[PDB]
Enzyme design. Structure first.
Site, mmCIF file in Angstrom:
data_model
loop_
_atom_site.group_PDB
_atom_site.id
_atom_site.type_symbol
_atom_site.label_atom_id
_atom_site.label_comp_id
_atom_site.label_asym_id
_atom_site.label_seq_id
_atom_site.Cartn_x
_atom_site.Cartn_y
_atom_site.Cartn_z
ATOM 1 C CE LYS A 1 36.519 41.713 32.308
ATOM 2 N NZ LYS A 1 37.620 40.786 32.583
HETATM 3 C C1 LIG Z 1 37.956 40.543 33.779
HETATM 4 C C2 LIG Z 1 39.406 40.205 34.110
HETATM 5 C C3 LIG Z 1 39.768 38.912 34.472
HETATM 6 C C4 LIG Z 1 38.711 37.799 34.654
HETATM 7 O O1 LIG Z 1 38.156 37.336 33.407
HETATM 8 P P1 LIG Z 1 36.646 36.743 33.373
HETATM 9 O O2 LIG Z 1 36.330 36.303 32.004
HETATM 10 O O3 LIG Z 1 35.782 37.721 34.063
HETATM 11 O O4 LIG Z 1 36.775 35.430 34.296
HETATM 12 C C5 LIG Z 1 41.070 38.655 34.828
HETATM 13 N N1 LIG Z 1 42.008 39.661 34.848
HETATM 14 C C6 LIG Z 1 41.657 40.935 34.501
HETATM 15 C C7 LIG Z 1 42.693 42.045 34.584
HETATM 16 C C8 LIG Z 1 40.358 41.214 34.121
HETATM 17 O O5 LIG Z 1 40.016 42.490 33.730
#
Ligand SMILES: *Cc1c(COP(=O)(O)O)cnc(C)c1O
Ligand code: HEM
Ligand code: HEM
Ligand SMILES: *Cc1c(COP(=O)(O)O)cnc(C)c1O
EC number: 4.2.1.22
Lengths: 490, 491
Positions: B77
């Site tokens: 993120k």
């Molecule tokens: C946001 C997130 C994901 C999913 O990724 P996206 O790009 O939203 O599909 C997977 N694992 C964690 C811990 C996340 O924070």
């Protein structure tokens, strides 16, 4: 069989000796391939990040840099000495496949060793003081390492010490070796060959000052030796915690306290790998400085690092005052916040240990006020045994948006019109169904006489906070607190 | 209020030239020797090979892992948080000192709070109450205000994190929701950067990619560029049981609504998710996820979160069709840091029933035995108020190495001969000084009817473990003793 960790060094190195006179096998830093064969190749090449805020807050004229070592695979500077010590041992023919590795440690070396052992297939037994954080234990146990504890405040001589117990275990176990981060040349050599080359290459050879906290001493010794060779103008500044004996002169060491909260730095003996001759000046730090400054590193610079890092910077802002513009100061940041999650990162721990006085003022005007100043309204009650659509009828007919669900008087939860409607439109619940399917079970209770800051804390965990008798007098959310603060704002 | 599930107005379709794109694209740049700030530490994450878990499950192909937990904030993120901010700043929509409000699983929240910390934005984070407290601690330390919303609150209802986020936005001046669900910056981050890294590292040769699904930006962003520059690669999405994202709808039919794994799955289809570029979907559960995450840790030495565990758990299934010379890249989103007290913790795994006590089987022979079977001897007891040299005298006189310091009969701690002598010889104490100076205060108590393995647990926290009845001490045990016993029983 017991080898003293404080046994004086037999190393014949002194400033001015050729790289040719050295008996030791040196490893040059190499380029990392496109695809890593295993995670152990993710150790080293840690970034040099600029400290943008904290340096100027304290009026440093110089450039304040931070070598962030918490980006290593295990998440500490120890991942370096753990790989190296293993690798060299393998070259000696001392470390054999399937063999047992035992180490006394602050736990960062333990995590790096358990990590490397997990990858390379060695059994790993770690002996650490009881003071060290449970987060370390969780990480070790997760890596598959066997764990033994020793009482903190137990003399390093005593049979109960982490080093001593490490040896007593070595004697009782076949094919068990102690790599001994306190006596092993691999510890400071790791830093001499890699860490120092990195610091120099990153800074283009120009370096005025280095600040580093001191554990076994491999980091500061290893760095300072090579720095004194390739950049002699650089001042080497060590950091020692109050309660340790490492600092010079001995006068600085005279102290009341014996044990302290900061993990990883300081000792009751002088380690073999530690060369105190290359440290130009020493500074004493304490637990408060460390935690305040670490939290400061996080909040200001966005560096998620441990307490020792906090000590290091806390001293750095002092020791680097002499320096002036155009000069740069490098700081060593040993490990990450991960180890400290429930200790210094936690406000309750900081209070309970008396590092955060509740006095230490920075909070807004509304912080101290009663919740009663909010202007609430007592909501309608309801049974858990009521049916969904029926509750819709009661809610719309009374013109309410939400009801706390109370027992035949135990508060069971909360049901809101919007979630009910939403749940029905999706077909997730029937009008004949029990309200307990859609109910919000989680909430916290408050007194009308509680403070708004308490509420501010509660709402960091829960959405609903019900003001209750010492009977619900009201339901409060963050939105209500906002409506109040902002209404009182204009 | 703008819907996060509103269908995409994007006119992209496979085969369009990059010139036709309306978007500002950002190329990956070389990192300088010294980083101006930590935000430059986001990206260039390592591609590590999976050496053990792949072969254990019989993958003939090469299993690779893109480790995203090496980012500054420690999650994938951190990428979308910088990007989303930068574009906004370039839009002139984001002004200095402005407030950023975001609904999140908490990783987006951490990347945003981090970026806000560096660049000086006020940051309000809205997350479900399900999410781990470690996240709360890291957020709070980063200087973010925290609001919680009930899990199981429908995404439509005003109590949802998205809804509450909007309601906060409406009441606060100069406040913007960057909106990871609708923001093109989220998948663009992955299209421009993450996918480029994956390609460069794999030298353009990639057979399959497996990724778990949150908002959907990772898989969407990666898959688009992958379909463009590496059409042979299969896109495999992972959705948790209870989420609605997977296709076809048949896969989504389930009993449960909420699940323990954090970061993936939703009760709505985010705008940024392009389901057309996902070749196949897989459903995962909590047990698979935690088992495999723990497996990543113990086997591969990768300290990563639960979603990574789901991703690999699916990977070992989906990658079976692949054969030698082919490679499968897996996305590992975040680190163990957020989950320290949950899946990493054995007691939590037990409490939630993921670790059955059956799977005791892997443990040694001595594991189920009574502690009393050790052959202890009730040691001599002394007063806490006794004097040092006196204790030395009694200890030498009876040939005891240590005495438990216990009138009420509650044990206060432990005193040992060697530590006393050492303490005196160093001059830290006088022979007339009291035992309290050198006393070891921390210890644990066990029952004779407890198992030796329970003791093995106890010894991971404490050095001394006293066998006592319900407060009569029948013996004192350390790890060394347990070793002496087992090894005696071995010869
Ligand atoms: C946001 C997130 C994901 C999913 O990724 P996206 O790009 O939203 O599909 C997977 N694992 C964690 C811990 C996340 O924070
Ligand atoms: C200039 C080159 C060097 C020479 C010629 C040299 C020489 C030696 C020798 C011969 C020993 C073995 C002592 C014995 O058993 O009799 C030794 C020990 C040791 N050296 Fe060096 N050394 C050099 C550089 C270094 C450097 C740069 C470091 C740190 C990075 C280092 C770390 C150690 C350590 C930790 C020991 C432990 C020895 C003991 O057990 O007492 N050496 N040195
Ligand atoms: C030639 C290639 C592309 C073209 C022509 C294109 C075109 C467009 C256009 C015209 C919009 C309308 C913006 C709006 O309505 O506000 C849009 C939206 C969007 N695009 Fe693209 N795009 C392309 C590639 C991509 C790629 C590669 C991604 C992701 C990696 C992407 C992600 C998005 C997102 C998330 C939106 C938001 C739409 C909404 O508001 O619902 N686009 N695109
Ligand atoms: C080991 C360690 C240090 C000290 O480093 P040395 O090279 O032993 O001086 C500092 N902080 C932490 C958290 C450590 O683990």
């Amino acid at each position: 069989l017991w080898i003293r960790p404080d046994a004086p060094s037999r190393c014949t190195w002194q400033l001015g000796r050729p790289a040719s006179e050295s008996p030791h096998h040196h490893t040059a830093p190499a380029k990392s391939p496109k695809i890593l064969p295993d995670i152990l190749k993710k150790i080293g090449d840690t970034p040099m990040v600029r400290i943008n805020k904290i340096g100027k807050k304290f009026g440093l004229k110089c450039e304040l840099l931070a070598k962030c070592e918490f980006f290593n695979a295990g998440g500490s500077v120890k991942d370096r000495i753990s790989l190296r010590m293993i690798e060299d041992a393998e070259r000696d023919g001392t470390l054999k496949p399937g063999d047992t590795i035992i180490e006394p440690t602050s736990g960062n070396t333990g995590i790096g060793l358990a990590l490397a052992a997990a990858v390379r297939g060695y059994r790993c037994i770690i002996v650490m003081p009881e003071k060290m954080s449970s987060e370390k234990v969780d990480v070790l146990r997760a890596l598959g390492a066997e764990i033994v504890r020793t009482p903190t405040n137990a003399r390093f001589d005593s049979p109960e010490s982490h080093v001593g117990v490490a040896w007593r275990l070595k004697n009782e176990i076949p094919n068990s070796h102690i790599l001994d981060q306190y006596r092993n040349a691999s510890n400071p050599l790791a830093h001499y060959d890699t860490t120092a080359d990195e610091i120099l290459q990153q800074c283009d050879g120009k370096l005025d000052m280095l600040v580093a906290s001191v554990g076994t001493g491999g980091t500061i010794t290893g760095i300072a030796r090579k720095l004194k060779e390739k950049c002699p103008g650089c001042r080497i500044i060590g950091v020692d915690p109050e309660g340790s004996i490492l600092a010079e002169p001995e006068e600085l060491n005279q102290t009341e306290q014996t044990t302290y909260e900061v993990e990883g730095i300081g000792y009751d003996f002088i380690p073999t790998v530690l060369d105190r001759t290359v440290v130009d000046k020493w500074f004493k730090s304490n637990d408060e400085e460390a935690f305040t400054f670490a939290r400061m590193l996080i909040a200001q610079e966005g560096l998620l690092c441990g307490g020792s890092a906090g000590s290091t910077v806390a001293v750095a802002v002092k020791a680097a005052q002499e320096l002036q513009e155009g000069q740069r100061c490098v700081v060593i940041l040993p490990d990450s916040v991960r180890n400290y999650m429930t200790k210094f990162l936690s406000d309750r721990w900081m209070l309970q240990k008396g590092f955060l006085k509740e006095e230490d003022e920075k909070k807004p005007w509304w912080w101290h006020l009663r919740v009663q100043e909010l202007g609430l309204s007592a909501p309608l009650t309801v049974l858990p045994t009521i049916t969904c659509g029926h509750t819709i009828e009661i809610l719309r007919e009374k013109g309410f948006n939400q009801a706390p669900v109370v027992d035949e008087g135990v508060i069971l939860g909360m049901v809101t019109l919007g979630n009910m409607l939403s749940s029905l439109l999706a077909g997730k619940v029937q009008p004949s169904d029990q309200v307990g399917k859609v109910i919000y079970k989680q909430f916290k209770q408050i007194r009308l006489t509680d403070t708004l800051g308490r509420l501010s804390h509660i709402l960091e965990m829960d959405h609903f906070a019900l003001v209750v008798h010492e009977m619900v007098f009201g339901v409060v959310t963050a939105i209500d607190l906002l409506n109040f603060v902002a209404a009182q704002e204009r």
